Design a binder for this molecule. Sequence first.
Ligand SMILES: O=C(O)c1ccnc(=O)[nH]1
Length: 160
Amino acid sequence: APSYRVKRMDIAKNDEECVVNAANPRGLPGDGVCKAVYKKWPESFKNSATPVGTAKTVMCGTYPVIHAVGPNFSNYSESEGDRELAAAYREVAKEVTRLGVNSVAIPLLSTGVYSGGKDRLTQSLNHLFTAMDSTDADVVIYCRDKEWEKKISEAIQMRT
Ligand SMILES: O=C(O)c1ccnc(=O)[nH]1
């Protein structure tokens, strides 16, 4: 029976069969979060460039890295941002299904340096749910803040 779980820890130490990288459209290593993914799976960044609102899988050996590019809300309108953030998660669902994996480690896209200084926990998480509800993979959501862990954990609780 496929579950959603949340873990407050480095996504680069996930124990799922694949990872989603919160990526930039240039396929650049990045800093903070993407840096952890670059350091862990540097060969997954070969031709990882993909436009905003898309996802691209690059294998690191047999381990799939799904580069998913949420919008930078600094650059987008609230309405266009929202559209691009929905589409990014939909492309993630498609890659997870295509790969036939049983589990996936996923961050909340567009909630860090791409949030345009706003709190987007509920926006990002609902788009994730919309996309991943139609898949049969175990989903493990990774976050850093304890407050965020609690809020995500409750949003999971109150749909079961
Ligand atoms: O702000 C973020 O967490 C983020 C950085 C890069 N790509 C994203 O989808 N999101």
